């Protein structure tokens, strides 16, 4: 505009412990033009495992922290959806 | 529904060196209806100081202006500086 900020939208998994990055600590984002991936900061919350059912609904999932671009334990117990 | 990811949209100042956080390394974000501030991660690009295009000088859309870029260090924008154009 004359007063516009630039928006960046990034995509996470919902959980009882907040928005989670993936196990590879690399989030998909989009600017008003393009799609790209950004590495999560160290210690951001990230998904370690999803306790899927063989068969919709929330699942139990375990939650870690990013450590140098990969999700590390020890795990915390959450529900994800 | 449960196939959707959760989007988080945060708002930055654009520049020749990419999207910038402010000098306090804290940005405005939106999740669904909630508006809130999040701390920028260490090493994110940020404005070192109070740079802006003075309202009087405006005569163009997205009129660009000189600005200085540092990196976030423990919630404050730190040098060394880089020279950028912001808009």
Numbering used by the authors:
A (entry chain A): 18 to 72, 79 to 104
B (entry chain B): 18 to 104
Lines from the paper:
To neutralize chemokines, ticks secrete small cysteine-rich chemokine-binding proteins in their saliva with no homologues in mammals, termed Evasins. In contrast to the highly selective Evasin-1, its homologue Evasin-4 binds ∼20 CC-chemokines with nanomolar affinity. Among this broad range of chemokines, the chemokine CC-motif ligand 5 (CCL5, also known as RANTES) is of particular interest, because it is one of the most expressed chemokines by activated platelets and plays a prominent role in the development of atherosclerosis. Thus, Evasin-4 binds to the CCL5 monomer and causes disruption of the CCL5 dimer by shifting the monomer/dimer equilibrium toward the monomeric form of the chemokine and not by direct replacing of CCL5 from the dimer.
